[PDB]
Design a protein around this ligand. Sequence first.
Ligand SMILES: *Cc1c(COP(=O)(O)O)cnc(C)c1O
Ligand SMILES: [Ca+2]
Ligand SMILES: [Ca+2]
Ligand SMILES: [Ca+2]
Ligand SMILES: [Ca+2]
Ligand SMILES: [Ca+2]
Ligand SMILES: [Ca+2]
Ligand SMILES: [Ca+2]
Ligand SMILES: [Ca+2]
Lengths: 301, 300
Amino acid sequence: LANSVIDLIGNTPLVKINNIDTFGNEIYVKLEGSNPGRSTKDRIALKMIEEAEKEGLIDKDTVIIEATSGNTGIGLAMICAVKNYKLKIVMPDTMSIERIQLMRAYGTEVILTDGSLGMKACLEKLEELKKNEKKYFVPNQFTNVNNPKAHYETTAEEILKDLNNKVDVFICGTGTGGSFSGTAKKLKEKLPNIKTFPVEPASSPLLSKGYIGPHKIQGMGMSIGGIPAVYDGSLADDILVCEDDDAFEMMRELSFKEGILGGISTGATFKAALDYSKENADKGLKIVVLSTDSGEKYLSN
Amino acid sequence: SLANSVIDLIGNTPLVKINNIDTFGNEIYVKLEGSNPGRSTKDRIALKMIEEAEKEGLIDKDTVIIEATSGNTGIGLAMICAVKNYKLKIVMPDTMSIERIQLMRAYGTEVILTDGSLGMKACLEKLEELKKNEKKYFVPNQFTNVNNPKAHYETTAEEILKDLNNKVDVFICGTGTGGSFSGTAKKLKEKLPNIKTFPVEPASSPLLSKGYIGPHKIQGMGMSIGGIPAVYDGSLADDILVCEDDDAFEMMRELSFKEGILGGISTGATFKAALDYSKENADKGLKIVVLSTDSGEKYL
Ligand SMILES: *Cc1c(COP(=O)(O)O)cnc(C)c1O
Ligand SMILES: [Ca+2]
Ligand SMILES: [Ca+2]
Ligand SMILES: [Ca+2]
Ligand SMILES: [Ca+2]
Ligand SMILES: [Ca+2]
Ligand SMILES: [Ca+2]
Ligand SMILES: [Ca+2]
Ligand SMILES: [Ca+2]
């Protein structure tokens, strides 16, 4: 028994890749789409809220307000439904409409900004919304230590446990950089020789080339006007990248060949990992790819 | 939770207690079959129908799998066939959610549509033409295949018994084929002779309770193949429950708003029926289990 869907967060499965040729290394995909909110962000939504509760920052009538590209908003929405908190989300209008529909299904109010202005415009709009709220809490996933800490505490421990501490490589897409940075930090503490790589959009190559651009890999990319505080670049053994169309193609390869329905970022991160495996062919490496969300919410794209 | 493929993730779904919605002094637990990798309970029957046919020698590498479905059985089959590299063709009514078509095609399925005003019977008729064009095929036929209710008899029911430590008073389940209801109820009644088990049908297509069919919006429920499916066992039903379309939608929204449970339309219908039942039997301390057949994302 679970007492609520909150008890279903985490403990997600790790699936081996069987049909796609992985070049003499083993690739495992951690399916964060299995979380009740259908993304890894359920983990950070839960920890950011639970820690704020313990700190006395959230009353029953505190309005939670967050800027998000979607999944953190969905995770927060689901948790706020269970907890009976009021949530307002600011999101760009360029993200999948299914994100809006999911948040609204849980009772969350959505405020939209012009997506050509990036997540920075969301953060600016949130400042305006604060002026009309008597009592609020902003989780601020871009700076809140409880974003990477959630992954340090749970995501990484699950990887270590499921693979019996045999992990050579970990690869993860980045937006805030929290899932990469928190997970890689714990993995590196327990497995000093592991290699950990973040992925970013080839069309918004902030970490690899120093500039941003428009791209279609929803959830990835850094558009707040700098590198998020929760990203820890010292953990990156290299920066990997993926083109928009390659990300979409790999998403369909995964569903056609493995029955794995992941999001666009999963396609991007997996493509990067498969390229890495090919470059490192026949080494018998155990490579773990984080699939951030499931692919259901991208049928409209 | 290391898995060799998504097939290993089928089953062992969670039972969640309802805590915010008023359940009238009984405990209601929802079995969340949306947690399956294909997002419905039909993953269980897709897996058993295919695995049993493999063992029988009815599926070779070049055998085309052909099935009529309202969606979820097709999605389950598609995900399993993707892993196993079998060619799948599905016939579905054009009145079901477009997300069903997109999901099945994502897994590589060829999806053929029939006019939904004609019901599932039209899908079954269309299967005849598809059979003529294939040298090797297997039709799982969820409406007649005992491996549909047997999957639930073997796994779903045992998970319910295990998770509640054999303390279950009432089981309530929506019907389309009748397989999930009939398989699960059969096992539960073999182990718990006092348990009450109820199927739910759409109030506006009350075939079992009133002997006629009609239009409804509770996708996945209802019987439109031209009679009662062979896998439905009406001797297990302690009564026939129903739900109206509007109430099913309202309850779907109540579940997501108040419990953070995003279930399909049939989950709203089945849950509303269980709530009504619980209200009529208020304050008896009954342990009521409701099967939530699928998750709600495909209805957006
Ligand atoms: C198939 C289905 C049903 C009916 O289940 P049976 O076990 O075939 O009676 C109910 N709800 C949904 C969402 C379904 O896909
Ligand atoms: Ca150490
Ligand atoms: Ca290093
Ligand atoms: Ca390209
Ligand atoms: Ca009462
Ligand atoms: Ca035999
Ligand atoms: Ca195929
Ligand atoms: Ca195909
Ligand atoms: Ca009504």
